[PDB]
Amino acid sequence: AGEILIVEDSPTQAEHLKHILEETGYQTEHVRNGREAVRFLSLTRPDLIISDVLMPEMDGYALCRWLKGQPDLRTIPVILLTILSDPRDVVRSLECGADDFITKPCKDVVLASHVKRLLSGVKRTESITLAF
């Protein structure tokens, strides 16, 4: 129990995220950019999303802004994996509206506890639901 969508362009980094999250017991799915995540979320609802920033088509900031715009999807917790190397990085992060920020190079332990914490938070909420 725990279905997590990983949004990551680097195949090896995606794999590392796959390893450490499945080892703690989550089921995971992988997508390469934000636009693919949109296509995924048309059919499937994950419990949590982890997105990197740098990606083709639709970057992680843009995906977060989009997710928080959608009335049924805004509730899914998003972790932004980000690198803050200049003031524009800080501004883009502050505006994207992710639920959690983790800067790259990170400890697996920290990523682990963040996922856990955010997922214990959404244990306070049907086959058919109307979108109106």
Nearest in space to 93 (alpha carbons), one of 105, 104, 81:
81
Domain ranges for the chain: 1-132
Method: X-ray
Task: Please say whether the structural domain 1-132 has been given the CATH code 3.40.50.2300.
Answer: yes
Question: What is the spatial distance between Cα 68 and Cα 103, in angstroms, rounded to a whole number?
Answer: 21
Resolution (A): 2.3
Calpha distance 97→25 (Å, rounded): 27
SS3 81: strand
